[PDB]
Amino acid sequence: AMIGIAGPMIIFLLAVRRGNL
Amino acid sequence: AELTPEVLTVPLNSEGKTITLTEKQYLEGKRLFQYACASCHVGGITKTNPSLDLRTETLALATPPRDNIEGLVDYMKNPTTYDGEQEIAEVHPSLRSADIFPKMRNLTEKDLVAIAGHILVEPKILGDKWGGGKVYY
Amino acid sequence: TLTYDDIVGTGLANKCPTLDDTARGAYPIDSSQTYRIARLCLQPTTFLVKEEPKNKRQEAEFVPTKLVTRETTSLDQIQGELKVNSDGSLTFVEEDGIDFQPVTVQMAGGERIPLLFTVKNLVASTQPNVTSITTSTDFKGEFNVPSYRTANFLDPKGRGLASGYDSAIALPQAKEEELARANVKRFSLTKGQISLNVAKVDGRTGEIAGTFESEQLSDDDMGAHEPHEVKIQGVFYASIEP
Amino acid sequence: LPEAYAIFDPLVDVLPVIPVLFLALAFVWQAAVGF
Amino acid sequence: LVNVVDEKLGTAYGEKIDLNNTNIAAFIQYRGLYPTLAKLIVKNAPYESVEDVLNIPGLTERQKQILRENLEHFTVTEVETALVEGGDRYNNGLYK
Amino acid sequence: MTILFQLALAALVILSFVMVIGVPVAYASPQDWDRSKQLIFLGSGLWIALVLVVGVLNFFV
Amino acid sequence: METLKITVYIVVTFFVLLFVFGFLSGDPARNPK
Amino acid sequence: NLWERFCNWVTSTDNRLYVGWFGVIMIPTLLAATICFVIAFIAAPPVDIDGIREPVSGSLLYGNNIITGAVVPSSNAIGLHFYPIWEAASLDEWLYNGGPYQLIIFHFLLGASCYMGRQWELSYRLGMRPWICVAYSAPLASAFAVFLIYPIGQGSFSDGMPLGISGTFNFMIVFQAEHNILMHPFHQLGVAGVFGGALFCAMHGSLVTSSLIRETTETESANYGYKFGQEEETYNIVAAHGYFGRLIFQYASFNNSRSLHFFLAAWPVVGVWFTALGISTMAFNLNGFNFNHSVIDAKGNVINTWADIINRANLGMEVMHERNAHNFPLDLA
C-alpha cells in the first residue's frame, strides 16, 4: 500500500507546489 | 450433508480397528495428495497405468491388502506390484526412493497417515466417481 | 558406419542390408547345433494385383500398381528358430519382429487396393538334405494374414465388431436386410504363400540375401466386399546365428 | 530467500507488479494536467 | 453374418475369465493373480481345459494353489481371432 | 557486524523510498534546486555507499 | 519431378527478384507529391 | 530504359487493377492457389488426413455437395514436413496424402500477405493515409491462425482448418472439445467484436439513412439524391446526433464523424485481433477456463454448474473425434 501511493503522492506534491506537470 | 465423524472413519489395520480423522486431518491429506500424487493419480485413477486404481475395492484385493491406513503407509514406504512380488520403488515414488523421487523427501509419518486417510475417505464422499474416470466427470 | 543422422529422411530406412557381389559362398549347417535367424528383413520392390476380368473365363493377370503410402513397406528385425529336420532340410518358424506393414497401392483406373503385407507365423522349409546354405537354397512356406483392421475399428457410420453400432442408425426405419453385409462386421484370416530364394551367401559372417515372391489376399473392409489377389516381389536379407 | 533477508519476503510478492503501476501513473499524471 | 464378439458373450466367456480370450486386465479382479501369474497364463494359452493352467512350467507350490482357489472363476472357450489378434489380450484399447 | 548489516540495509530502503519520491518532486519543482541539487548529489553518493556496505557485509551474516 | 522442382525454383526466383529489385528501384519517389 | 518502363507500369495508377511490387508476388500465388483449389474441390480423390490409412473423401466427383466438400488437409504422417509435388513419387501418392492442401494454403497465405501490402502500396501511390491494411490484418491474422499457426503448435498441418464448409465446422467442434474456446476470453472478445461490429454497422447505416437530406421525390430512390463526388455532405450529422443522443443520453453519442468512423474501425479489428490470438495461443495448449468440479458442498459432493454441463458435451466430442487414431489414453496430439 505504501509503495502504491508513492506514485500518486508525487503528482499531488507537484500540484500543490505548482510544479512542472 | 457434512463431512461428519462418520464419514471420516476409515479402517486402521486389517483386523477391524479404525481411526477417526478430523476435518483438518482430511484437508491435510487432500493437499498432500495433490502435491505428491495427483500428477499420476488425479481422481483416483492412474494415468500411467489405468488398470490399477485407488478404489477401496481394488486396494482390498491387492497383496498385501492396501485398503487400510497401515498398508497404504507401508505402500508409500515400500511399494509393490499388485501381488506383492516385485518391489517397485525404483519406478514408484516412496520414502525408500526419495532420492530419485524428491517430492517424497519432506513427508513426515503424520503426512503419510493423512494421505492414506484421504485415499480411503474420498470414495466415501464421491462414490463411483473416485476411480471411475471421465464417464463420471 | 552410418548413423541415424546420416540416414534420416533419405529412404535408406526402408532398404534391407545388401551383400556385395563377392558373396556366393556356402554357410555350413552342423546337424549337431541349433540355429536361429536373428534378423530377417523384407523389402518389397513391386506390388502386383490380379485384375478382375469381365466374364471371359480367361487368364486373370497380375497388373502393376502404383504405391501411394510411401517408404513404409519393409519388414525387418524378424527373428525365429531354424530347425534342422530329420531328413536334412531346414525350417524357419517365424516368432517376432516388425513382421507386417499396411500397404496401399493404386490400380489403373484409380482404385486403391489396401493390403497387409506380412509373414506373420511363417513356416518356411528347404529341400531335403541341405548340408550348407548355398546360392541355390530356397525357402518356401505359408503364413497367416490377419484382418486389415482389428476388432476396435469403427467405420465412418460408427459400426464395428468389438465396438460401435450394429446398424445404419442414420436410417432408423430402412429395411436392414439389404445392409446386413455392411451392418455385421467380420474379422478375416487368410493364408499366404512365400518363397525366399537365396542369391548371395557370406559363409564367413553367416548372412544370406536374395529375392522373394509372396502371394496373399488384400483387404475386404471387414467383409463388405471381396478381396483382390496380390503378388509382392522384393529382396530380403537374413542372418543365421548358432 | 536467504533467511537473513526473510524479513522482506512480503515485499518481494509485490515488486514484480511495480512496472505496471508505472503505466497507471502516466494516467494519474495526465488526469492531473487535464489531458 | 454373425458378430463373433457378441456371440461369445453368449458362452461362459460372458461370466468368467476365459483363459484363452480374455484381456489380461481381468486378472486384477482376483487376489494374487496380477501381474506375475497373469503374464504366465496369457503367455501359455490356449488350454484344452481350465485344469491345464496348473501345468505351466516354473510355478511355485504357492502359485499353484493360488490358481486352484481361482479355478472356480475360470472357463475355457474356443480360440477367437478377433479377441486375440492385434495383441489385444495385452491392450484391447480400453483404459478408463 | 550483523547489527551493521541490518541497519545499513534498513537505511537503504528508507533512503530509496525518500529518493524515489524526492528526486522527481525536486526536478520538477521551481527554484527548489539551490536546495535539492546538492542534497540529491550526496543522496546519490550515500545510496551507492549503502548498496556497497550491504553487499560487503552480506557475506558476514 | 526433378524437372518440375527446377522449373518452380526458377519461376520463384524470377518473381522474387522482380520484387526486391522493383522495390529498390526508387520506391519512395513514386508518390503524388 | 526498359526496366524503368516495366517499373512505371508495375506501379501505374492508371491500371484498372493496381499491380505493384507486392502484386508481382500476389497475382501468381493467388492464381496458383485458386486454380488448384477449384480442381481439387471438384476432382481430388480421397485423402488420408489422419494418417491411419482411412481416406476421407472431399470432392464433388467423389460424392460431395457444396456443403460437404473440402480440400482435405495433408496427412498426419506428414506432420509439419514440407510436402510439395516433387517430394512425392507420383501425382497419385501426392493426392492420397494431401498435397493440394499445402500447395493451396502456402500459396494463399503468401498471396494474402501481399494483398495486405498491396493495400499500403496503392494507398501510398494515391496520396492516402496508410492504415487500411492494418484493418485487413485482422482477418489475415485469423487466416494465419487456423491454416499455419495452429498446425505449428499442434505439430501437423492435418489439424489445419479444412478448406470446406463442413470441414470448418469439424474444426470448430474438435477445437472446443480440445481447448474449451467458448470459455476463453479471447474468443469472447471476438464474439464481442463481430456481434458488436454487426450492431454498429447496423447502427451507423440506419442513423445515416435516417438523416438523409431530402433531394428526391417519392417516385425515385433516395439514393439518386447523392452524386458521386459532391462536396456537400449528403446527410445531417447534427440531426443524427440529435436523434441518437436522445435515444441514450447525449454524451453517449458521437458528434465527430472522424471519431465515430475511427470507432467503427477499431471495435471489430481489435476484437478479431484477439480472436486470432486466441487460436494462436491455444495452438500452444493454453486453454480456456476450466471450472470442472469447481463448486463443492460441505460434505464434498460435487455441485455442478453450467461449466460441468459444457464439460459433458466437450467429453462427447472428445471421445468421438478421430475415433480410430488413439492408442493411448491421453489426447496429447
Add this chain to the structure above:
Amino acid sequence: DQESSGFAWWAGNARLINLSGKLLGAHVAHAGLIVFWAGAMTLFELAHFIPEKPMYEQGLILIPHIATLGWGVGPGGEVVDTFPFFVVGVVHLISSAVLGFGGVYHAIRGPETLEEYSSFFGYDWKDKNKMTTILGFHLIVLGIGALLLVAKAMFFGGLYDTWAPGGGDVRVITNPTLDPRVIFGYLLKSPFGGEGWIVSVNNLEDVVGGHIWIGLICIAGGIWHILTTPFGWARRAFIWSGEAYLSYSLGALSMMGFIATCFVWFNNTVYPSEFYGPTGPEASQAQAMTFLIRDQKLGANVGSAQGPTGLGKYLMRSPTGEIIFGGETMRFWDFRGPWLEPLRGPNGLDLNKIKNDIQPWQERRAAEYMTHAPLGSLNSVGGVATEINSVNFVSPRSWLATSHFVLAFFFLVGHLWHAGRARAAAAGFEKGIDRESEPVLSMPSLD
C-alpha cells in the same frame, strides 16, 4: 499541449521525436523498467521456489534461464545452491535504480535537446552519417554481449548441457563449432518439419560457436557503420526519419518474437527440459514410451503388435522408413531427447534395445514427462480441457510460447502502423488529402 506539436495526449510520446534529451530520458527510463522486472521477478521466483519440486511445476521462467547458463544447478538439473539466483536478481534490481535515476533526470530535469549541449550525443534523424554511427556503437555492444555468453561457456563455469554423457550436467565448452558449413548451415535449413531452421540447434558446441560468429560479425559491422556512410542505392531505397527507423525495428522485433516462440516450443537444448518441462512432441513421445514399457513388461511383443487401424500399435515407420513410435504420436517422430536417443539405432528405434536395454531412469523420465505435457487451462488446471480440477500446472513453455506470439503479432501490427505513417509523413500527406490538390482528381479515369 496538443496545439504546440499536433499530437494528442494519447499520442503524447510522439512529441518526443525531435527532443533528443527527453527522448534519451524515456529510453533510459524504460530500460530501467525491464531490468527492474528482471530482478524483481527473480526474487519473487526465488521466494516461491521449492528445491524438492521441479522448476516447471512452480511457474518459473527466469530461474530456468539462469540455470541453463550453468549457475545454481548440478547433475541432471537438481538445484544445489540458490545463492546465484539471489545475486542475479539483486544486481538487476540495484542496476534498475541507476537506469531509473538517469532516465528520470534526462526526462524532466536535463536539457530537452542535446544538439546544442554536445555535438557528439546530439543527432538529427535525417543525418545518415550520425545514425549509422549510433547503429555502429550499438552493434559493437551487441557483439560484446554475445561474446560474454561464449566467455561464460568457455572460461567461467560452462553451461548446462542436457546431452552430457551420464545425464545432463554443467559442462565447460572446449571446442566450439567454427566450421561455417555447420554454423551457417543452420541458417539455411528449411523451417518445416524434420528440419527446423535455427531452432534445430541441438548441441552446445553449435550454440557457443554461432555466438563466436555473430559476436565477430557484429563488431565488424559496427566498425563498418562507424566508418562509412550509406551508399547511394540504400539512400534511395529507404525512408530516413525517426519513425521510419522505429518501424524497421518493430518488424525486426516482430520477426525475433515469432522465432523465440518456436524456439521455446520445439527446442530442448537451450531450453533444457529439466527446467522448462518437456516439449509438446516430447511428452507425447514419452506417453508412447511409457505404455510400451508397461505392456512389454506384461508380455507383449511390441514389434509385431498390430493396432486397430492396421498400423503398428507401438511401432510403425515414418514416410522415409524410420522406425517410430506408433499411434497418433506418429506426427512427433522428429523429436529428439536424451532420455530416448539410447534406444535409437541407425534405422530408427531399435527393437532389440527396446526389449532389453530400457533403464529404470528412462521409465521414470517418460512417465514424468507424459504427466507434465504442456497442456492446461488459462487458470492453470492441468490437462485437456475435459480434466477435473486437481493439478495446478501450466508448462512454462506454454506460458512463454503464447506470450511471445502475442507480443510478436502486435509488434508486426506496430511495424505496419509506423511504416506506413513514416512513408506518408515523408511524402507529406500523413494528415489527409489537400482539397486543392487531390491526386486522384488529376489522374485519368479507370474507364
